mmCIF file of C-alpha atoms and ligand atoms in Angstrom:
data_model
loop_
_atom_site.group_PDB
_atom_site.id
_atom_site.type_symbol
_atom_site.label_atom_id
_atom_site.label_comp_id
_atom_site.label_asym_id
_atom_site.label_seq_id
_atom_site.Cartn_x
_atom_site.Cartn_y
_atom_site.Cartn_z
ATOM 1 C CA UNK A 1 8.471 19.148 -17.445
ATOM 2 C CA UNK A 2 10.877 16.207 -16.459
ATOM 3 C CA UNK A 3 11.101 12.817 -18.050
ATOM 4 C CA UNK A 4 11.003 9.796 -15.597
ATOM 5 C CA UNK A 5 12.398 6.537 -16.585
ATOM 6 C CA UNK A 6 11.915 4.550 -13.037
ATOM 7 C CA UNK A 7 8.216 5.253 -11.603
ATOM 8 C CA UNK A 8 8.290 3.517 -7.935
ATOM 9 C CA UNK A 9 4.494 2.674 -6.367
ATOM 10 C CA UNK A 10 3.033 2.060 -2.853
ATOM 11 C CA UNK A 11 0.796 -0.744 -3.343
ATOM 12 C CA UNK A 12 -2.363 -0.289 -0.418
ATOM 13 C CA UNK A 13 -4.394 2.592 -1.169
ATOM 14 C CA UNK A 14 -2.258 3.502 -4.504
ATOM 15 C CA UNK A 15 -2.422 0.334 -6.503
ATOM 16 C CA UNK A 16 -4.723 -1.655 -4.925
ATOM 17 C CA UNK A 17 -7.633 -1.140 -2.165
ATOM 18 C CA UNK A 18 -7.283 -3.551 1.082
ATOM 19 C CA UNK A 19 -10.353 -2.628 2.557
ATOM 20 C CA UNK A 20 -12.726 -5.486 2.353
ATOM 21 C CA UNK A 21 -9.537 -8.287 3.585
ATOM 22 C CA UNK A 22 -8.123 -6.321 6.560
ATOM 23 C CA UNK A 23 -12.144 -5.304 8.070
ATOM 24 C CA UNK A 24 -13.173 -8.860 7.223
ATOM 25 C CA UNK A 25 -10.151 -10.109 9.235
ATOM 26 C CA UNK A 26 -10.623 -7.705 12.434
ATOM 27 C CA UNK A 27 -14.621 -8.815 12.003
ATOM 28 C CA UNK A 28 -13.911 -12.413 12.216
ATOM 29 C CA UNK A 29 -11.428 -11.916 15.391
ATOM 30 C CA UNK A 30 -13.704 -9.213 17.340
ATOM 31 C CA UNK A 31 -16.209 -12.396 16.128
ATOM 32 C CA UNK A 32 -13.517 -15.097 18.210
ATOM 33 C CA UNK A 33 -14.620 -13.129 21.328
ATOM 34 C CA UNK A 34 -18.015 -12.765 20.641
ATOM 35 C CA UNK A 35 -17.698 -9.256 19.442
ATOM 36 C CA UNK A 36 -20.623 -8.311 16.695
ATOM 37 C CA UNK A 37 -19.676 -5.556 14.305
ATOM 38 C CA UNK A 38 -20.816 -4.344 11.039
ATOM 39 C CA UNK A 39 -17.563 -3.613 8.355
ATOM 40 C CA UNK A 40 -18.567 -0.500 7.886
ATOM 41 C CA UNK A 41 -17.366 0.783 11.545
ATOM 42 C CA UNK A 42 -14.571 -1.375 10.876
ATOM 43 C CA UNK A 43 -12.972 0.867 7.824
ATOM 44 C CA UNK A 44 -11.073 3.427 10.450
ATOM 45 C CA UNK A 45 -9.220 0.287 11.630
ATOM 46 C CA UNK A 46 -7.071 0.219 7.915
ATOM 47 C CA UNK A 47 -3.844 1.964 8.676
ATOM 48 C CA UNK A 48 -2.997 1.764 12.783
ATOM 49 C CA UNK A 49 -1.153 -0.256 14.162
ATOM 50 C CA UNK A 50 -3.632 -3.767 15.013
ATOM 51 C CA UNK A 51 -2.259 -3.037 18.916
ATOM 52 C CA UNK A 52 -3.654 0.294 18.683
ATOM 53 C CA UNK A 53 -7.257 -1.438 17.566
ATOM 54 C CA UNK A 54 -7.521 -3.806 19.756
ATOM 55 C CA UNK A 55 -5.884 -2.638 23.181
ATOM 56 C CA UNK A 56 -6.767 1.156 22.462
ATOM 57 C CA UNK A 57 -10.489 0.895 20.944
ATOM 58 C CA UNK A 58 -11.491 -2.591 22.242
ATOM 59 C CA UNK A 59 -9.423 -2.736 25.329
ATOM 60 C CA UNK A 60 -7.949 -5.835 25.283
ATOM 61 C CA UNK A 61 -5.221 -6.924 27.364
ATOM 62 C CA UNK A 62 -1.793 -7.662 26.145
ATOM 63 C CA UNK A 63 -2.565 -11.398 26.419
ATOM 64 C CA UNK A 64 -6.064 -11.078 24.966
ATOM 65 C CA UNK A 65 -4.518 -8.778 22.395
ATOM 66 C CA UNK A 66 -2.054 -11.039 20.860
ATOM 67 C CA UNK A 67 -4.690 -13.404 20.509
ATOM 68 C CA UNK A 68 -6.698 -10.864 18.724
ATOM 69 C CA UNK A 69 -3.813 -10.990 15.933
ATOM 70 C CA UNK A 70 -3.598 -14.439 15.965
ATOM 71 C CA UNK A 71 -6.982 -14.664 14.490
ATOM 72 C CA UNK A 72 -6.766 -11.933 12.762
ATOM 73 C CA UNK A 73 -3.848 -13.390 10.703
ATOM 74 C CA UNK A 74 -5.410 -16.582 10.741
ATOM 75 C CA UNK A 75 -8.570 -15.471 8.420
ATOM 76 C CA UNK A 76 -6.128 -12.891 6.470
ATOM 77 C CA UNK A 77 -3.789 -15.854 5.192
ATOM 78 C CA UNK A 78 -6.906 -18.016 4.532
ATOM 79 C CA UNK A 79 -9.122 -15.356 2.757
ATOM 80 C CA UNK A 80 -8.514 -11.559 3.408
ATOM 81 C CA UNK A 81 -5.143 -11.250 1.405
ATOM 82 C CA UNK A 82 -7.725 -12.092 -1.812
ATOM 83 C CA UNK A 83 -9.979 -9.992 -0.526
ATOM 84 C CA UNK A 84 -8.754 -6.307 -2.467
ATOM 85 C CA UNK A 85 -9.651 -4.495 -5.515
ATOM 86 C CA UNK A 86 -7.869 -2.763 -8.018
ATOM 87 C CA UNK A 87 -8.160 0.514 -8.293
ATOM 88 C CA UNK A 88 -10.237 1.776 -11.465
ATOM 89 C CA UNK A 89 -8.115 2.440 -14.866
ATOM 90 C CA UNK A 90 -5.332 1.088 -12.679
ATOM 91 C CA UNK A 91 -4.326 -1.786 -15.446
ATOM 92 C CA UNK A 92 -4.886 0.600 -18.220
ATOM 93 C CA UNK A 93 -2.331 3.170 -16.725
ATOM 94 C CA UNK A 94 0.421 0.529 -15.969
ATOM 95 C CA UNK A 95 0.332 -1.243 -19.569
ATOM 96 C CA UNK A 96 1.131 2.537 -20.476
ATOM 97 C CA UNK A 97 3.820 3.222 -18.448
ATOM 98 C CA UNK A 98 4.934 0.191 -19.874
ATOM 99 C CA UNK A 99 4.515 0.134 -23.232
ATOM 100 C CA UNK A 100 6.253 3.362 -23.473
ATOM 101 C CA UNK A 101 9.617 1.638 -21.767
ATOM 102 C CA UNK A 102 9.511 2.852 -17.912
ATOM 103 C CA UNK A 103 10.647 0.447 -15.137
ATOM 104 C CA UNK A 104 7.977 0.302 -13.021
ATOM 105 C CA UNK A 105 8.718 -0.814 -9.183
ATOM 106 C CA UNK A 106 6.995 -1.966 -5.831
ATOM 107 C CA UNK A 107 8.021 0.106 -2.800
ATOM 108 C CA UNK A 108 5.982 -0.995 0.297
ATOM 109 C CA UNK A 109 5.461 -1.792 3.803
ATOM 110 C CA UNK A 110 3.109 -4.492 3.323
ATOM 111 C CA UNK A 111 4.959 -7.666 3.606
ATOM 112 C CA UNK A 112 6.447 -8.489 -0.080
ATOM 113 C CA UNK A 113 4.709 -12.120 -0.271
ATOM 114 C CA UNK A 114 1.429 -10.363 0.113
ATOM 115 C CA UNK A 115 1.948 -7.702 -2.300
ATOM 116 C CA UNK A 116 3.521 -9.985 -4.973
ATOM 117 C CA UNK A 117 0.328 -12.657 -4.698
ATOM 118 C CA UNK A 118 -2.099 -9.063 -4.652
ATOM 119 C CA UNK A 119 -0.065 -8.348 -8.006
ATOM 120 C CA UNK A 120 -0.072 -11.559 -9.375
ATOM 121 C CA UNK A 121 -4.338 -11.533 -8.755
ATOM 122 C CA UNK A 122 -4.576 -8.860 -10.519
ATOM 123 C CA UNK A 123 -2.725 -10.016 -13.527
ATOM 124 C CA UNK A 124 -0.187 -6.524 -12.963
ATOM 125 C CA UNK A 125 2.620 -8.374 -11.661
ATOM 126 C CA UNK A 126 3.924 -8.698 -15.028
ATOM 127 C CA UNK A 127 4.760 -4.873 -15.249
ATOM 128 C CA UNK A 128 6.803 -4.730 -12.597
ATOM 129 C CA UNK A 129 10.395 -5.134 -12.871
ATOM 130 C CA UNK A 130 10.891 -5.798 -8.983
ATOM 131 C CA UNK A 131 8.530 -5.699 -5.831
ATOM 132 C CA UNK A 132 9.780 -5.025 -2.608
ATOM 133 C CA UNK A 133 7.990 -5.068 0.811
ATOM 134 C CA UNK A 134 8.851 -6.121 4.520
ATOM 135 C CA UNK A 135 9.281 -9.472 5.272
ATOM 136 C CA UNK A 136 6.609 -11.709 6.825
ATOM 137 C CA UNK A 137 6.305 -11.765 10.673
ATOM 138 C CA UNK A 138 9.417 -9.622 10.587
ATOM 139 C CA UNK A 139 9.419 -5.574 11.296
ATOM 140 C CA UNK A 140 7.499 -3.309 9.294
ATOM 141 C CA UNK A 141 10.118 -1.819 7.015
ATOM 142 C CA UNK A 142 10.468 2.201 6.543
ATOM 143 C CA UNK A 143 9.837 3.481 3.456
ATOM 144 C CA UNK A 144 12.995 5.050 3.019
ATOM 145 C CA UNK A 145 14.687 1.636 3.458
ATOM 146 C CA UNK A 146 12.598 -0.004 0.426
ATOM 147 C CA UNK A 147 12.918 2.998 -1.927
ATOM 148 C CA UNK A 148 16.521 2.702 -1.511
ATOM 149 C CA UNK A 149 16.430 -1.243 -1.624
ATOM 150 C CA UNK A 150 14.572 -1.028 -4.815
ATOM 151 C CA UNK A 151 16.396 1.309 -6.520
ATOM 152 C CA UNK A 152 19.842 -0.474 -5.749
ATOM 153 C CA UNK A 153 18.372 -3.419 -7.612
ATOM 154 C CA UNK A 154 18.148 -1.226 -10.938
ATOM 155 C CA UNK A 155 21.675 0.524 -10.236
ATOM 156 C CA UNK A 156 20.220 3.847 -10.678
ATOM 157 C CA UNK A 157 22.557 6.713 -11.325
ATOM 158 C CA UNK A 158 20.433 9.455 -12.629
ATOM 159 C CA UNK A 159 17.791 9.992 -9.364
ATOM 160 C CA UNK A 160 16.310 13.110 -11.139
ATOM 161 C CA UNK A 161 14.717 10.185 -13.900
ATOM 162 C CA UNK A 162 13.418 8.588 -10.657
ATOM 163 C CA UNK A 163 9.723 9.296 -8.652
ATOM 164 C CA UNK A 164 8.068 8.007 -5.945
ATOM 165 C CA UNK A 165 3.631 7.170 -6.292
ATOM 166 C CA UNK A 166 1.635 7.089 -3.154
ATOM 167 C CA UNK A 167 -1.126 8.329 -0.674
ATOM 168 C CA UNK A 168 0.181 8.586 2.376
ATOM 169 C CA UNK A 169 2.879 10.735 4.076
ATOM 170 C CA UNK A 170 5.169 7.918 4.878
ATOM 171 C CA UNK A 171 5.652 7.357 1.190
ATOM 172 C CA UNK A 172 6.238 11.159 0.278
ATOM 173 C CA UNK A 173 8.156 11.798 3.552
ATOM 174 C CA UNK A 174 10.222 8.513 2.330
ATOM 175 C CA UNK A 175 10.930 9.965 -0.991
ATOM 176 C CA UNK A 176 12.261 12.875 0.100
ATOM 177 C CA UNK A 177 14.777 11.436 2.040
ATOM 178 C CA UNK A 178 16.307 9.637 -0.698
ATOM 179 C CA UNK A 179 16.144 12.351 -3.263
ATOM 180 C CA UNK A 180 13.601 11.460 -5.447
ATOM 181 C CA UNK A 181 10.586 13.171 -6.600
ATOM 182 C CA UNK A 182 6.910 12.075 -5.741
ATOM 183 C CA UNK A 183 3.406 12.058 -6.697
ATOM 184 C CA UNK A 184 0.862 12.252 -3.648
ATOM 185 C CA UNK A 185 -2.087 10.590 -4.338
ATOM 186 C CA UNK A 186 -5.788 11.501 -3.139
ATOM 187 C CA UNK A 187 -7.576 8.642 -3.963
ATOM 188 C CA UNK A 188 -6.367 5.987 -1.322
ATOM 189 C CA UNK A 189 -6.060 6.844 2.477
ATOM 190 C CA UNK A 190 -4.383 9.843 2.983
ATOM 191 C CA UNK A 191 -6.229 12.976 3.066
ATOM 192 C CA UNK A 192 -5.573 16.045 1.258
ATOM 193 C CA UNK A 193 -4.631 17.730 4.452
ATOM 194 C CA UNK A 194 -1.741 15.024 5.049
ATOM 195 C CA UNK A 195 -0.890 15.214 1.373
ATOM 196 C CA UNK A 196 -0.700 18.713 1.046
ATOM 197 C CA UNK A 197 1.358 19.463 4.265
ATOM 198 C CA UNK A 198 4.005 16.208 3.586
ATOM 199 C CA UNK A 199 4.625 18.956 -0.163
ATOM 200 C CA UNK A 200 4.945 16.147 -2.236
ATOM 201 C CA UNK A 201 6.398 17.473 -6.264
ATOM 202 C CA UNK A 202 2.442 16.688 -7.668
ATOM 203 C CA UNK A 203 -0.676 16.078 -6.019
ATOM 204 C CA UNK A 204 -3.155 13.858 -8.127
ATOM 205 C CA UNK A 205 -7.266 13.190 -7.360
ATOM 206 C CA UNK A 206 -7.806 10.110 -9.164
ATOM 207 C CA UNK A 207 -5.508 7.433 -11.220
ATOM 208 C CA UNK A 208 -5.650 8.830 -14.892
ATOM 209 C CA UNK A 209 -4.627 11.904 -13.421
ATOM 210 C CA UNK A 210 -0.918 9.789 -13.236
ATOM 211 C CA UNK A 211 -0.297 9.612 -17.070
ATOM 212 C CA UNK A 212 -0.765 13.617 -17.495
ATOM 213 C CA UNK A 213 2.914 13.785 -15.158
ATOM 214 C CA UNK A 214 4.554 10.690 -16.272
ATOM 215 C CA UNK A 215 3.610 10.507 -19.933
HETATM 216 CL CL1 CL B 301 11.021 7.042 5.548
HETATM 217 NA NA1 NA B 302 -0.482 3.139 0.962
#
């Protein structure tokens, strides 16, 4: 069994659960076009691409579509980026990691002044050494790209003390190209089949599964 010392986490669908901000967001912009839907038929829309959404499921037209993300946006500054939950035992496995002297890291796509407010919500933000995203209104960064970023920011030396916590391929797939190990998780948005076939080092079904590998 290996000993990390540097534990690096996704932060949608691993830390924290977007759902209710990002369906409440595409609800009140279908809503800007007089489009009624419930949230619940909403939920497949968490993870595309908002293009896809709108131009491939709604059909909107490029112009029509960028106005789409406009409002979007709009109600995701005001109100959706509050709009999460943690995920259960979350805290309780953190203050562990903690407590027990691992440097704990943010590695994600979502722009970094959304996951550091999400963080700071949640009161977690504290356990975090650094948190790294994309920037706002900027390109959505590769995974790859902020595992590396992240990790120069600690001057790491010894990788094999170093892994990787997510639920989606991207973060697994990510991993692996910088030569770190990784935990896939099951709990978020990726699916077992995804998991399985991205052959991340562990596969976990729920968050206190986490402390039987790292602790
Ligand atoms: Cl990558
Ligand atoms: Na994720």
């Amino acid at each position: 069994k290996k000993n990390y010392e540097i534990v690096l986490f996704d932060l949608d669908g691993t830390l924290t659960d977007p759902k209710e901000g990002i369906t409440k967001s595409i609800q009140y912009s279908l809503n800007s076009f007089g489009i009624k839907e419930d949230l619940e038929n909403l939920d497949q829309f968490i993870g595309p691409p908002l293009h896809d959404t709108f131009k491939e499921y709604y059909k909107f037209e490029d112009k029509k579509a960028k106005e789409a993300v406009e409002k979007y946006r709009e109600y995701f500054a005001d109100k959706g980026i509050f709009e999460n939950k943690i995920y259960e035992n979350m805290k309780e496995i953190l203050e562990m990691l903690y407590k027990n002297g691992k440097i704990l890291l943010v590695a994600t796509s979502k722009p970094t002044v959304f996951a550091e407010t999400i963080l700071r919500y949640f009161d977690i933000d504290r356990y975090f050494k650094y948190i790294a995203g994309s920037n706002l209104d900027g390109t959505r960064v590769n995974k790859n790209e902020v595992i590396q970023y992240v990790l120069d920011l600690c001057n790491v030396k010894d990788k094999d003390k170093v892994i990787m916590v997510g639920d989606r391929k991207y973060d697994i797939i990510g991993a692996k190209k910088i030569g770190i190990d990784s935990i896939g998780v099951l709990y978020g948005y990726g699916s077992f089949e995804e998991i399985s076939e991205s052959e991340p080092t562990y596969i976990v079904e729920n968050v206190e599964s986490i402390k039987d590998i790292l602790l």
